[PDB]
Motif scaffolding. Structure first.
Motif, PDB file in Angstrom:
ATOM      1  N   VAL A 282     -35.773  51.546  39.325  1.00 18.95           N
ATOM      2  CA  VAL A 282     -35.966  52.853  38.716  1.00 18.95           C
ATOM      3  C   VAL A 282     -37.445  53.029  38.420  1.00 18.95           C
ATOM      4  CG1 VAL A 282     -35.772  52.363  36.253  1.00 18.95           C
ATOM      5  CG2 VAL A 282     -34.923  54.506  37.146  1.00 18.95           C
ATOM      6  N   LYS A 283     -37.886  54.283  38.449  1.00 18.82           N
ATOM      7  CA  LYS A 283     -39.296  54.625  38.481  1.00 18.82           C
ATOM      8  C   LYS A 283     -39.543  55.787  37.532  1.00 18.82           C
ATOM      9  CE  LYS A 283     -40.660  55.046  42.628  1.00 18.82           C
ATOM     10  NZ  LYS A 283     -41.128  55.454  43.984  1.00 18.82           N
ATOM     11  N   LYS A 284     -40.780  55.893  37.060  1.00 18.62           N
ATOM     12  CA  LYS A 284     -41.143  57.010  36.204  1.00 18.62           C
ATOM     13  C   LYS A 284     -40.847  58.329  36.904  1.00 18.62           C
ATOM     14  CE  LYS A 284     -45.058  59.030  33.725  1.00 18.62           C
ATOM     15  NZ  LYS A 284     -44.198  59.485  32.601  1.00 18.62           N
ATOM     16  N   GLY A 285     -40.271  59.265  36.156  1.00 17.49           N
ATOM     17  CA  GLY A 285     -39.897  60.556  36.684  1.00 17.49           C
ATOM     18  C   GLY A 285     -38.522  60.612  37.311  1.00 17.49           C
ATOM     19  N   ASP A 286     -37.858  59.475  37.490  1.00 17.25           N
ATOM     20  CA  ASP A 286     -36.529  59.466  38.079  1.00 17.25           C
ATOM     21  C   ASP A 286     -35.520  60.102  37.132  1.00 17.25           C
ATOM     22  OD1 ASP A 286     -36.812  58.326  40.649  1.00 17.25           O
ATOM     23  OD2 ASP A 286     -36.977  56.319  39.785  1.00 17.25           O
ATOM     24  N   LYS A 287     -34.481  60.695  37.710  1.00 19.60           N
ATOM     25  CA  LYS A 287     -33.330  61.156  36.947  1.00 19.60           C
ATOM     26  C   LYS A 287     -32.273  60.057  36.971  1.00 19.60           C
ATOM     27  CE  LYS A 287     -30.551  64.338  35.030  1.00 19.60           C
ATOM     28  NZ  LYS A 287     -30.144  65.434  35.950  1.00 19.60           N
ATOM     29  N   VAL A 288     -31.884  59.576  35.792  1.00 19.47           N
ATOM     30  CA  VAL A 288     -31.005  58.421  35.673  1.00 19.47           C
ATOM     31  C   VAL A 288     -29.827  58.777  34.781  1.00 19.47           C
ATOM     32  CG1 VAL A 288     -32.822  56.728  36.068  1.00 19.47           C
ATOM     33  CG2 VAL A 288     -32.303  57.462  33.729  1.00 19.47           C
ATOM     34  N   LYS A 289     -28.757  58.003  34.929  1.00 20.04           N
ATOM     35  CA  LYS A 289     -27.569  58.108  34.097  1.00 20.04           C
ATOM     36  C   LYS A 289     -27.347  56.778  33.393  1.00 20.04           C
ATOM     37  CE  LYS A 289     -22.543  58.200  34.462  1.00 20.04           C
ATOM     38  NZ  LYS A 289     -21.388  58.265  35.394  1.00 20.04           N
ATOM     39  N   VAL A 290     -27.077  56.832  32.092  1.00 19.81           N
ATOM     40  CA  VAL A 290     -26.833  55.628  31.303  1.00 19.81           C
ATOM     41  C   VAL A 290     -25.409  55.152  31.555  1.00 19.81           C
ATOM     42  CG1 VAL A 290     -26.711  54.671  28.980  1.00 19.81           C
ATOM     43  CG2 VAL A 290     -28.516  56.306  29.568  1.00 19.81           C
ATOM     44  N   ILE A 291     -25.267  53.911  32.033  1.00 22.42           N
ATOM     45  CA  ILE A 291     -23.954  53.362  32.363  1.00 22.42           C
ATOM     46  C   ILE A 291     -23.434  52.387  31.316  1.00 22.42           C
ATOM     47  CG2 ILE A 291     -24.282  53.688  34.830  1.00 22.42           C
ATOM     48  CD1 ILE A 291     -24.856  50.646  34.993  1.00 22.42           C
ATOM     49  N   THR A 292     -24.274  51.926  30.393  1.00 30.31           N
ATOM     50  CA  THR A 292     -23.808  51.125  29.270  1.00 30.31           C
ATOM     51  C   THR A 292     -24.660  51.449  28.053  1.00 30.31           C
ATOM     52  OG1 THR A 292     -25.200  49.231  29.884  1.00 30.31           O
ATOM     53  CG2 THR A 292     -22.936  49.243  30.708  1.00 30.31           C
ATOM     54  N   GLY A 293     -24.058  51.326  26.882  1.00 33.22           N
ATOM     55  CA  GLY A 293     -24.733  51.560  25.623  1.00 33.22           C
ATOM     56  C   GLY A 293     -24.040  52.633  24.809  1.00 33.22           C
ATOM     57  N   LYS A 294     -24.650  52.941  23.665  1.00 32.72           N
ATOM     58  CA  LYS A 294     -24.115  54.001  22.823  1.00 32.72           C
ATOM     59  C   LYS A 294     -24.210  55.358  23.506  1.00 32.72           C
ATOM     60  CE  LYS A 294     -22.232  55.358  18.969  1.00 32.72           C
ATOM     61  NZ  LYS A 294     -22.060  56.762  19.440  1.00 32.72           N
ATOM     62  N   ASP A 295     -25.225  55.556  24.348  1.00 33.16           N
ATOM     63  CA  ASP A 295     -25.446  56.818  25.041  1.00 33.16           C
ATOM     64  C   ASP A 295     -24.860  56.819  26.447  1.00 33.16           C
ATOM     65  OD1 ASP A 295     -26.751  58.201  22.979  1.00 33.16           O
ATOM     66  OD2 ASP A 295     -28.674  57.269  23.466  1.00 33.16           O
ATOM     67  N   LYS A 296     -23.800  56.049  26.676  1.00 35.25           N
ATOM     68  CA  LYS A 296     -23.200  56.000  28.000  1.00 35.25           C
ATOM     69  C   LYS A 296     -22.786  57.396  28.446  1.00 35.25           C
ATOM     70  CE  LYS A 296     -19.543  53.968  30.772  1.00 35.25           C
ATOM     71  NZ  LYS A 296     -18.544  52.887  30.936  1.00 35.25           N
ATOM     72  N   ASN A 297     -23.040  57.694  29.717  1.00 33.98           N
ATOM     73  CA  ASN A 297     -22.779  58.963  30.397  1.00 33.98           C
ATOM     74  C   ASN A 297     -23.811  60.037  30.075  1.00 33.98           C
ATOM     75  OD1 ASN A 297     -20.377  58.122  31.748  1.00 33.98           O
ATOM     76  ND2 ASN A 297     -19.235  58.449  29.846  1.00 33.98           N
ATOM     77  N   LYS A 298     -24.789  59.781  29.211  1.00 30.14           N
ATOM     78  CA  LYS A 298     -25.911  60.698  29.100  1.00 30.14           C
ATOM     79  C   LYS A 298     -26.808  60.573  30.328  1.00 30.14           C
ATOM     80  CE  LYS A 298     -26.598  61.378  24.119  1.00 30.14           C
ATOM     81  NZ  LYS A 298     -27.518  61.060  22.995  1.00 30.14           N
ATOM     82  N   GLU A 299     -27.561  61.633  30.599  1.00 31.93           N
ATOM     83  CA  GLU A 299     -28.479  61.664  31.726  1.00 31.93           C
ATOM     84  C   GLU A 299     -29.830  62.183  31.263  1.00 31.93           C
ATOM     85  OE1 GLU A 299     -26.642  63.983  34.785  1.00 31.93           O
ATOM     86  OE2 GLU A 299     -25.229  62.387  35.306  1.00 31.93           O
ATOM     87  N   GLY A 300     -30.894  61.618  31.820  1.00 30.71           N
ATOM     88  CA  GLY A 300     -32.233  62.039  31.452  1.00 30.71           C
ATOM     89  C   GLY A 300     -33.248  61.569  32.467  1.00 30.71           C
ATOM     90  N   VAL A 301     -34.465  62.030  32.276  1.00 31.28           N
ATOM     91  CA  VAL A 301     -35.595  61.621  33.098  1.00 31.28           C
ATOM     92  C   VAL A 301     -36.231  60.393  32.467  1.00 31.28           C
ATOM     93  CG1 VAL A 301     -37.930  62.265  33.810  1.00 31.28           C
ATOM     94  CG2 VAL A 301     -36.044  63.858  34.132  1.00 31.28           C
ATOM     95  N   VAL A 302     -36.787  59.526  33.307  1.00 29.75           N
ATOM     96  CA  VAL A 302     -37.486  58.337  32.834  1.00 29.75           C
ATOM     97  C   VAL A 302     -38.881  58.755  32.380  1.00 29.75           C
ATOM     98  CG1 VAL A 302     -38.610  56.229  33.561  1.00 29.75           C
ATOM     99  CG2 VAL A 302     -36.199  56.596  34.090  1.00 29.75           C
ATOM    100  N   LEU A 303     -39.125  58.699  31.071  1.00 35.51           N
ATOM    101  CA  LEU A 303     -40.425  59.098  30.547  1.00 35.51           C
ATOM    102  C   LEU A 303     -41.481  58.027  30.781  1.00 35.51           C
ATOM    103  CD1 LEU A 303     -39.336  60.802  27.209  1.00 35.51           C
ATOM    104  CD2 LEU A 303     -39.912  61.886  29.385  1.00 35.51           C
TER     105      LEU A 303
END
Ligand SMILES: [K+]
Ligand SMILES: [K+]
Ligand SMILES: [K+]
Ligand SMILES: [K+]
Ligand SMILES: [K+]
Ligand SMILES: [K+]
Ligand SMILES: [K+]
Ligand SMILES: [K+]
Ligand SMILES: [K+]
Ligand SMILES: [K+]
Ligand SMILES: [K+]
Ligand SMILES: [K+]
Ligand SMILES: [K+]
Ligand SMILES: [K+]
Ligand SMILES: [K+]
Ligand SMILES: [K+]
Ligand SMILES: [K+]
Ligand SMILES: [K+]
Ligand SMILES: [K+]
Ligand SMILES: [K+]
Ligand SMILES: [K+]
Ligand SMILES: [K+]
Ligand SMILES: [K+]
Ligand SMILES: [K+]
Ligand SMILES: [K+]
Ligand SMILES: [K+]
Ligand SMILES: [K+]
Ligand SMILES: [K+]
Ligand SMILES: [K+]
Ligand SMILES: [Mg+2]
Ligand SMILES: [Mg+2]
Ligand SMILES: [Mg+2]
Ligand SMILES: [Mg+2]
Ligand SMILES: [Mg+2]
Ligand SMILES: [Mg+2]
Ligand SMILES: [Mg+2]
Ligand SMILES: [Mg+2]
Ligand SMILES: [Mg+2]
Ligand SMILES: [Mg+2]
Ligand SMILES: [Mg+2]
Ligand SMILES: [Mg+2]
Ligand SMILES: [Mg+2]
Ligand SMILES: [Mg+2]
Ligand SMILES: [Mg+2]
Ligand SMILES: [Mg+2]
Ligand SMILES: [Mg+2]
Ligand SMILES: [Mg+2]
Ligand SMILES: [Mg+2]
Ligand SMILES: [Mg+2]
Ligand SMILES: [Mg+2]
Ligand SMILES: [Mg+2]
Ligand SMILES: [Mg+2]
Ligand SMILES: [Mg+2]
Ligand SMILES: [Mg+2]
Ligand SMILES: [Mg+2]
Ligand SMILES: [Mg+2]
Ligand SMILES: [Mg+2]
Ligand SMILES: [Mg+2]
Ligand SMILES: [Mg+2]
Ligand SMILES: [Mg+2]
Ligand SMILES: [Mg+2]
Ligand SMILES: [Mg+2]
Ligand SMILES: [Mg+2]
Ligand SMILES: [Mg+2]
Ligand SMILES: [Mg+2]
Lengths: 101, 59, 91
Positions: free
Chosen positions: A3-24
């Motif tokens: 994964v790289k800066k600026g990528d759009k990613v989805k959280v697959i584990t953690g408290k924020d699972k299924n959230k999506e965001g850009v890599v800051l």
RNA sequence: GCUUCUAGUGAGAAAACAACUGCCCGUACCGUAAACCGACACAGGUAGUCGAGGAGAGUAUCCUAAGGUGAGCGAGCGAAC
RNA sequence: GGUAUGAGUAGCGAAAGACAGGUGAGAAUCCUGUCCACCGUAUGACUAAGGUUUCCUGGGGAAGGCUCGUCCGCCCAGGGUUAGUCGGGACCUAAGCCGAGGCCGAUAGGCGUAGGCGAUGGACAACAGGUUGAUAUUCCUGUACCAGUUGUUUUUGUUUG
RNA sequence: GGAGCUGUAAGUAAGCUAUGAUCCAGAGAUUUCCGAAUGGGGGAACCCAAUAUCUUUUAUAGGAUAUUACUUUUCAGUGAAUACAUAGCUGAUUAGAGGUAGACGCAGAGAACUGAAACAUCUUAGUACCUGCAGGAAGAGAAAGAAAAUUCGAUUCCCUGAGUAGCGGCGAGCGAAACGGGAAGAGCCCAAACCAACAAGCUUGUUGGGGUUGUAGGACUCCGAUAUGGUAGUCUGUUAGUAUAGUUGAAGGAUUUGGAAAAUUCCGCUAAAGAGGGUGAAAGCCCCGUAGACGAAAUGCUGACAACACCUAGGAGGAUCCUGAGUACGGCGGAACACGAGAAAUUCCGUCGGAAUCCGCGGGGACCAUCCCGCAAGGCUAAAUACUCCCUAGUGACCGAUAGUGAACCAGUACCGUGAGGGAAAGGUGAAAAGCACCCCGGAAGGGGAGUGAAAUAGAUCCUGAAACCGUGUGCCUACAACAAGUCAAAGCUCGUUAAUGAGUGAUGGCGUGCCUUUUGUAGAAUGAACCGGCGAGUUACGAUUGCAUGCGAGGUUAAGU
């Protein structure tokens, strides 16, 4: 990292699972990354940082890179990344669909 | 940078080096006082001098 | 060593600032430079005329941070007195 | 070092005046000590110099000069030992 | 290694202090004042060694200080050591040490000549005052001296010089 | 290699990067001063010079670069006593000089405690230590051998022979070798005769040829072939491989619990990959990887191939010549051989004496004869063997912070010592700092709230948090009692359990001198322990022997090694 800066990613584990965001920002040496609106922490700051009240600041803390899956831009779904050569440029290919990046 | 250094002639590189050593002298004096803002310049100048001397040696 | 490397920097302190009122300028100098070299370096760097150069060695000073202790670097201080009827240094 | 003597060396010497040149290292502070040697801010030990006045042979002694000091637990009580 | 017992006991390291005012959250213990007392061939003034920043200034009071502490030779942050003439080197040698070749010796090495090193000795050109919070025969002021350099003028010598 | 980077280490500051940064690997450049140090000196990291060239200043002073130690090798030049010379001297040339990996090898020199139940022989030992020389290995090595099954055919090392033969105050102990079986294997060059050339004072040196040994060889004289084979040669290229960066690399979603899932349940899938690590708990399918496939500009290393170089003659003749001398060997004195002078062969060192030479010489454990086996006094030689400071990848019925290295941590540090030298202690918040904004008491320290967090009695002296020890609360008891302090009996009071003919406390009564060690005998007025915690003592290897067990049984069994 995969994964790289600026990528759009989805959280697959953690408290924020299924959230999506850009890599800051990406931290390759730590295998960690910061994702917008993910893993927010409430920080109790003394006002010595040009904030003339101090206050409790909400910031994103890093999460391990293996808790994030890159989103297929053409499909909107998270996918594993493959490396196939295109135009002689080595690029990331969506294992699920075959799209690039 | 290295490309343009190799273009210059030996005499130009000798002169270019003396201009940099003087700039380095001035930067140290500007740093000793509170007058130097771009402190990263000092390293830039030092390496530019090093690049010239390296090139001078491989000719 | 090059003349431009002999003089490292000026010394700005209450004592050196006072000495400037008497037209003498304090510099940190390369530890291996004799006061004659310093005279030549000062003249070429500033176009001034030097009347006298006094030179001292400054011992390394013991200092500690946290659990670590060591010494500051040794220094060489040159007080350069310019002649009358001569340009001053403007630092 | 210096002063002489020739042997050698010599084309230039000297005086006066003017201007100018002269490197490196040490140079703080304590030092009959709380800062040195004694594990201690320890009644010990530490070469040399100066070391005043009265009385005095004196650098003895007592009190003082210049100067320095009141010394890193105190307050009571005023038993035995 | 930790923690007891002895104990809140021994000890707190040769001596005079008192009070006023101040500072401060807090003072028998820090500052100032006054009187008192102690050393004075000294407990004064220098300096070699040794120490190696302990010096100065501004802050600090955890620890260190045998009590206390607002204070400190402690801690923090800045600063401070200026020389042709002082002491040492670019001068000299003593004891001693090292030692080209050399002599001697299972190895290693030992000894030692020339030659050196080596002060505690020899030699060697400036002083008084002033100045800083901290250096001064080092800085400054005045007035000197020693070695040498360039130039000007003056004399006399150019190879029986 | 492909997006961040400016180390640990944050912080601000100022910057770099798709014109490819940081980072990674190969190759280069720079590389102050000390240190063999080496221009001279010196109390290492400093000081002070000479000569040449350059530079600074009007100039002196100043600066830069180069060269300059000692001895050795060779050459040249100068050049003493002293005639020629030689020595010395100057220069050039050439090569050493120190350090290690605290290991392994060879050599010089060489203990003692110890054992012998004392102790001088002996043993510990040719060990420790010191010193020299090494090399990647060293040493040994191509028979003057082992033998006497008749034969073997350099050396080294492993198994065995064998705790045998022997040695030994015949004590304590010391202790082979050959044969047999294996690992690995490889052989070669000189000296002399003789020939040729040159130089010199018929020989007498230099060079080249020649020649290399034991069923004797060679020279020499005859003939006859200029072939055929071999190699422990070279920065000779070419080539391949390989080391030193890398690329690629399958397959999971929900559900329940939770702060978090990889746990769980449900259905799936991938596997030449179910090694392993990481990820908010335990993941074949999230990440790094793994199996597999793939990759090299550069520099090494290795192997081939080529080149080149270097070695390699058969047979018949004996008239003569050669075949290692101050050597072999002997006396004397020591030493090494398992072998301690012994009946002592074999090898070596010192000293003195001192041969033969092919019809010869040496050995076969005193010695002689016979027979057999060999041919010294010259040198070289790969492999099998020893060791590992380092490098790369791994392994462990190895340690898990009093362990494991002394050192998991800024340790050979702090600290101690004049010095050599001695030498510590010290790991853990949390998933993430989200490291407690703000308020309140306080000068601060520190607390109380409020927050963060799943949890802060996880708040940094931070996981867990034992015991000694210190304290607070109080159910029962205690101010007429002499008590190793418990035990048995027991009222009263206070409590209610792993529900058990329960628990705590205990007036009063009976009985009763700790533990250990060492002793004939200890409460002992003998020893040891302040207390608590941790650590702290019959083990392993090779052999002997017996019991038990299993396999096979007049048989049983392999060792080294592959
Ligand atoms: K001074
Ligand atoms: K008198
Ligand atoms: K007196
Ligand atoms: K006091
Ligand atoms: K009393
Ligand atoms: K009494
Ligand atoms: K105690
Ligand atoms: K106590
Ligand atoms: K203070
Ligand atoms: K001086
Ligand atoms: K003296
Ligand atoms: K040296
Ligand atoms: K080693
Ligand atoms: K013995
Ligand atoms: K014994
Ligand atoms: K060899
Ligand atoms: K045996
Ligand atoms: K015996
Ligand atoms: K031959
Ligand atoms: K993960
Ligand atoms: K795993
Ligand atoms: K290669
Ligand atoms: K014998
Ligand atoms: K034999
Ligand atoms: K034989
Ligand atoms: K906890
Ligand atoms: K109690
Ligand atoms: K009882
Ligand atoms: K006793
Ligand atoms: Mg000075
Ligand atoms: Mg002083
Ligand atoms: Mg004292
Ligand atoms: Mg008592
Ligand atoms: Mg006292
Ligand atoms: Mg008095
Ligand atoms: Mg007196
Ligand atoms: Mg002070
Ligand atoms: Mg102060
Ligand atoms: Mg105190
Ligand atoms: Mg002097
Ligand atoms: Mg000597
Ligand atoms: Mg010698
Ligand atoms: Mg002499
Ligand atoms: Mg003088
Ligand atoms: Mg002073
Ligand atoms: Mg030197
Ligand atoms: Mg014995
Ligand atoms: Mg994969
Ligand atoms: Mg599952
Ligand atoms: Mg023997
Ligand atoms: Mg014999
Ligand atoms: Mg003999
Ligand atoms: Mg034979
Ligand atoms: Mg070998
Ligand atoms: Mg340890
Ligand atoms: Mg533990
Ligand atoms: Mg330890
Ligand atoms: Mg708890
Ligand atoms: Mg805890
Ligand atoms: Mg009674
Ligand atoms: Mg009663
Ligand atoms: Mg008895
Ligand atoms: Mg007892
Ligand atoms: Mg008793
Ligand atoms: Mg006891």
């Amino acid at each position: 990292m995969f994964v790289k800066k600026g990528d759009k990613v989805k959280v697959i584990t953690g408290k924020d699972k299924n959230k999506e965001g850009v890599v800051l920002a990406a931290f390759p040496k730590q295998d960690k990354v910061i994702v917008e609106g993910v893993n927010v922490v409430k920080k109790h700051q003394k006002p010595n940082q040009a904030a003339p009240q101090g206050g409790i600041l909400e910031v994103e803390a890093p999460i391990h890179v293996s808790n994030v899956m890159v989103i297929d831009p053409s499909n909107g779904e998270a996918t594993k990344v493959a490396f196939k050569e295109v135009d002689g440029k080595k690029v990331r290919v969506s294992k699920k669909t075959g799209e690039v990046l | 940078k290295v490309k343009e250094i190799r273009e210059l002639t030996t005499a130009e590189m000798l002169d270019k080096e003396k201009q940099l050593k003087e700039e380095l002298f001035n930067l140290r004096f500007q740093l000793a006082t509170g007058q130097l803002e771009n402190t990263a310049r000092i390293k830039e100048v030092r390496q530019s001098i090093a690049r010239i001397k390296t090139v001078l040696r491989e000719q | 060593m090059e003349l431009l490397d002999v003089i490292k920097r000026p010394v700005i302190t209450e004592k050196s600032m006072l000495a400037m009122d008497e037209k003498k300028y304090t510099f940190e100098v390369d530890t291996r430079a004799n006061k004659t070299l310093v005279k030549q370096a000062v003249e070429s760097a500033f176009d001034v005329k030097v009347a006298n150069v006094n030179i001292l060695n400054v011992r390394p000073k013991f200092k500690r941070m946290g659990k670590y202790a060591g010494y500051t670097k040794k220094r060489r201080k040159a007080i350069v007195t310019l002649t009358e009827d001569s340009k001053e240094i403007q630092l």
